[PDB]
Amino acid sequence: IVGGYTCEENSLPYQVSLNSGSHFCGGSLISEQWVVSAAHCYKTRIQVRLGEHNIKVLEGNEQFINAAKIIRHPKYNRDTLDNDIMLIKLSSPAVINARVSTISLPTAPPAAGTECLISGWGNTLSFGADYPDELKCLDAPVLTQAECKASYPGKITNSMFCVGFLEGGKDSCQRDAGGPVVCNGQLQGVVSWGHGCAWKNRPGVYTKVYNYVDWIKDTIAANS
Amino acid sequence: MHSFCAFKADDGPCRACMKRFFFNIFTRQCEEFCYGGCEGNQNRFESLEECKKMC
């Protein structure tokens, strides 16, 4: 997260991390046993970490649960980034408490101008590398689809929307992928891609979770 | 030199941090970077040894 602030400790209990040797992506806990992330965060073996604030200095109250099933959207395409969304089934249900709890699926798509909250442990610099141990937060508005498309001509599919600032300086960044964009208490986006981080006219592009609510429910039910 | 050894390291547009190595032409050494998980260029390797072997 570039240009953000440090989230209050455990103020985002739905925020999880994907781990394989190190923290490589984020995710969102959407039910006891299921996490939403980005398909480009796919690996065959993943440890999910929940309840974290500082990823290096563990309090001892965190939950570490291996992914039992890791399912990318079947129309995910690595070159176009279309349908960049993935479900993880945890090998056991997470224990729901003040620090680990779910984020609601969206009941309407995101409206242009709606304020959202984007979070993760990604790079905090546009032109350098500073990877924070403490979870970072960013308030940012949903952009019009026209601003989105104009920023990335030919690249914005129906599965995508833009959130951020055309003036640059505030964005998600590498190591944030897979994490949440929350608007009005609902998971609207998954952190996906952008051209650099926080560059002028290159806002973050996010997978539109609303488009996948039915796929999410079908996948959960079929794997229950 | 293999041409790709002289490509600028490219994390690509995706926003993961997949640990990879690239050949740094200024330092003549292989260095670790966060590859975002898509696109990028061939100056990218899984291990320091592959980067050292190729470059």
From Swiss-Prot, chain A:
The modification Sulfotyrosine is found at Y131. Optimum pH is 8.5. Its EC number is 3.4.21.4. One of its GO terms (biological process) is digestion. The active site is at H40 (charge relay system), D84 (charge relay system), A177 (charge relay system). Binds 1 Ca(2+) ion per subunit. One of its GO terms (cellular component) is tertiary granule lumen. Ca(2+) binds at E52, N54, V57, E59, E62. Detected in pancreas and pancreatic fluid (at protein level). Expressed in pancreas and brain. Detected in ileum. Belongs to the peptidase S1 family. This is Trypsin-3. It comes from Homo sapiens (Human). The chain holds residues 81 to 304 of 304 of the full protein.
UniProtKB/Swiss-Prot annotation, chain B:
O-glycosylated. Mostly in endothelial cells. This inhibitor contains three inhibitory domains. The first domain interacts with VIIa and TF, the second one with Xa. This is Tissue factor pathway inhibitor. Disulfide bonds join C5-C55, C14-C38, C30-C51. Coiled coil: none annotated. The record marks R15, A16 as: Reactive bond. Inhibits factor X (X(a)) directly and, in a Xa-dependent way, inhibits VIIa/tissue factor activity, presumably by forming a quaternary Xa/LACI/VIIa/TF complex. It possesses an antithrombotic action and also the ability to associate with lipoproteins in plasma. Residues 5-55 form the BPTI/Kunitz inhibitor domain.
